[PDB]
Design an enzyme around this catalytic site. Sequence first.
Site, mmCIF file in Angstrom:
data_model
loop_
_atom_site.group_PDB
_atom_site.id
_atom_site.type_symbol
_atom_site.label_atom_id
_atom_site.label_comp_id
_atom_site.label_asym_id
_atom_site.label_seq_id
_atom_site.Cartn_x
_atom_site.Cartn_y
_atom_site.Cartn_z
ATOM 1 N N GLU A 38 26.490 13.776 19.250
ATOM 2 C CA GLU A 38 26.287 12.347 19.551
ATOM 3 C C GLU A 38 24.969 12.149 20.285
ATOM 4 O O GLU A 38 24.531 13.035 21.018
ATOM 5 C CB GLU A 38 27.440 11.806 20.378
ATOM 6 C CG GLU A 38 27.528 12.389 21.772
ATOM 7 C CD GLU A 38 28.698 11.845 22.568
ATOM 8 O OE1 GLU A 38 29.454 11.034 22.015
ATOM 9 O OE2 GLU A 38 28.858 12.237 23.731
ATOM 10 N N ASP A 120 34.791 13.132 27.090
ATOM 11 C CA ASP A 120 35.293 11.865 27.664
ATOM 12 C C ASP A 120 36.002 11.100 26.553
ATOM 13 O O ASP A 120 36.223 11.665 25.457
ATOM 14 C CB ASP A 120 34.158 11.026 28.236
ATOM 15 C CG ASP A 120 33.066 10.706 27.229
ATOM 16 O OD1 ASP A 120 33.138 11.215 26.092
ATOM 17 O OD2 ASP A 120 32.142 9.951 27.589
#
Lengths: 211, 505, 52, 83
Positions: A38, A120
């Site tokens: 990401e 997360d």
Amino acid sequence: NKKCSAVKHNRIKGIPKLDDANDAGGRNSTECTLILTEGDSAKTLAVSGLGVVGRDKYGVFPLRGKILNVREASHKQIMENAEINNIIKIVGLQYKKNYEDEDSLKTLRYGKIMIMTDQDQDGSHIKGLLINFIHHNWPSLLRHRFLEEFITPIVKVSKNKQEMAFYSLPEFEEWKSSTPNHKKWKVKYYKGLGTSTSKEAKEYFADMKRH
Amino acid sequence: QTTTYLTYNDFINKELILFSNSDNERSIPSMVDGLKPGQRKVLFTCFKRNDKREVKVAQLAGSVAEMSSYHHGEMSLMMTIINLAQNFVGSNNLNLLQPIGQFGTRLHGGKDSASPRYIFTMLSSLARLLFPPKDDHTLKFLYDDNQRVEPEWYIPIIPMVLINGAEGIGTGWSCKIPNFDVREIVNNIRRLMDGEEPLPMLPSYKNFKGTIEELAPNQYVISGEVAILNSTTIEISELPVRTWTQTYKEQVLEPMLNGTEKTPPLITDYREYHTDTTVKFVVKMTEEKLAEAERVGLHKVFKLQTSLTCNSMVLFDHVGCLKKYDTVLDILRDFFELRLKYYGLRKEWLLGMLGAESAKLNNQARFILEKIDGKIIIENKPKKELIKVLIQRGYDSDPVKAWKEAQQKVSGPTFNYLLDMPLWYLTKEKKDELCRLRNEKEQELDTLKRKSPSDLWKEDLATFIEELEAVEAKEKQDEQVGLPGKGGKAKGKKTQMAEVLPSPR
Amino acid sequence: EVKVAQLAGSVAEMSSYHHGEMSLMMTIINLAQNFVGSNNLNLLQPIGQFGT
Amino acid sequence: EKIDGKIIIENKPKKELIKVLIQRGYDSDPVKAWKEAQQKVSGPTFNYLLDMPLWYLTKEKKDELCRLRNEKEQELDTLKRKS
DNA sequence: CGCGCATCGTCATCCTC
DNA sequence: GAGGATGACGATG
DNA sequence: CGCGCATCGTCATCCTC
DNA sequence: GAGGATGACGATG
Ligand SMILES: COc1cc([C@@H]2c3cc4c(cc3[C@@H](O[C@@H]3O[C@@H]5CO[C@@H](C)O[C@H]5[C@H](O)[C@H]3O)[C@H]3COC(=O)[C@H]23)OCO4)cc(OC)c1O
């Protein structure tokens, strides 16, 4: 036009951000993997880490952010996004081509796809979006060991050259509740993948059987 | 006042020249501290707090803007903070901020660093050693925004211009100073302090294996590392400084892989064995092409020899003017004299100040002893009456306030500190501690009066070298843990070559 | 008064914010607008231009 | 009591002074007591009784302390009385 | 720093029918 | 040997 | 956050001659 | 009167 004609038959030279592997598209492509990260900070960690494993069966391509959902979207909007077009161009998928026999998998230029993001909730959402994207148009690929995940620790402790890794907060809470001599170790929270150093990346890729 | 019109001559000779002066001030380093005002503000803000633990970069920049009075945008400041921490090959031979996180590798121009909120930082152990804590009183400060702010320069124990380089583009002037080796600088300073003649030096780098050649004064050539593994293959081990792996690949391997408009494809295959610090390129080609490249020279074929010059030695002065320096030894001698001028100032400041602190402790002890004797009665006595009784004793005001006033030269009596001590001080258990503390202060003052200021610099150098030993040991251990052990380790004869013609201008 | 950038830095320093200062500056601005349609009451005084 | 001259602290051991102080009826810091009572869900404590500088040993400050304690008593009475 | 594009649930219109 | 062209870099728009 | 394009002086090559 | 389409907004990638 001459430049566009040259553009083809040379792996995928369209995007500079792509770090192509050695056997990508050639022989033994069934084992050539591809790492999806990401943002762009994780690309630095992946490249710094690949120094130990190699450049043959691993390639890194950074993403941008939330991937467009494709289960309910207009075909025009699907064609508008360029990141999905780059993903297909790197992998080599086709929309109406069923992948049932192992030869169809061999036709592709990469064997497996390993996704890695932050530990997360946002990384979890991005992984879910990618799984939805793959399942919506290729249901058969989800039964051949094609997708995989890379995980990192979220918090570490340190006291006298000793450390203990922790991946989930419930495990850290359990370690706090079950162990005496607590708070002697120096706590250190990890939020982004960029927080880790070169030594930590080498230790992460050394223990492949755990991540 | 009111202005109906404005002439162009006055418009240029009064306003734009101010921009030119400001740009030259903010884009050229100083010969004293080897820093720039942007770097100086961050280094001062980091000095203000102790920061025993780590700290985030975003909150650090916020604190810098809070105290250093920075008015140029946090985005332009985060890049400077990152630049003050990189330690990879070619960036800085010494760093002031420890690299916690990823501050950019040697692959994408250092611009591949993570987000400022992803990375952490903390002052290195060498920061407080280069800048002794007892030098804040020596330098002059400013009062931007009615606030005690950072000073104009700093006084390190090494010339910082010669250790971390200086590259800047200004107006009317430019700066370009390569790096050097810290040990050679320490040896030269130790040699000069005695009175001997300094030795010629050569620009070096930390963690670098390439060769450096000097042909003309202020001109140098750098060559990388190439080897011949077999009669067909070739290996590139190290690239010269100011060269990036991604850029070198896209600008050399790509043009050579396919045939260009006028050249056949020279190379046939290339593979990369890259690490975080070292690089390894394996190129397979034609044996006839290899013989041709050997006849012509491998360094010229693969662009390994890179030249550099030194003609932009422009820096500021202790006053503020600019000078066009010619030799490094000139900078070394100038820094040596400027540092020598301040030993007397530091000695004269620490002396007298330690004596006044000892005198204040002596006055406090005498007051406590007189109170234990029972002569001083403070029960239900007016403050004015108590002061009238105290002055006639011989008791004086705060000497720290006296030194502060004597420094500020360029409401009556003061006896607050003699009565601000809590009752805990009225016990022997604390009286003994006060007595031993004043004796220790007397001993320190005697040692200062006895010692000489110049030898202190050599002591400081000894401590700095002792710390640098541990620092380099940890730095080497960082690679030793990374050291994989089993890996491809190609070894081959190395060709070392120099330009046949100096071609000196 | 106080600058917004240093204020966001202090918030990240003490409030343990871990979502990026850029996403936080917009929230700080949103907590100060007082034009017609935005907020009938504000908690931060509008010193400057907080958008018309 | 110190102005009266009963409490003698000149070259007196901290522990001996605490032993003399406790027998008087003097208790620990009530602020610490409330903090402990809140936290429920190293021995005696007499630091604040000796952390006052000598300035407090004058009538000019004794009068201010007396008026301050009277004001605190009035505030407590008003709180007990109001709704 | 500005525009670059994404999620996610309700819904006020907006374009056909 | 002899001339024009150009990007390289760093604090800031 | 990533790429977007700009100044400003020296200069190492780079493409003609 | 009756149905599909779509952007509007806000904290975060
Ligand atoms: C480009 O590289 C990355 C980008 C991101 C996203 C992002 C993604 C975008 C995108 C923009 C953004 C941007 O948000 C924008 O901020 C703007 C700030 O000014 C206000 C006026 O308007 C805001 C936009 O409403 C918002 O969309 C980033 C801010 O911080 C992020 O987390 C955002 O437009 C295209 O896709 C994450 C990454 O890795 C984690 C990346 O590597």
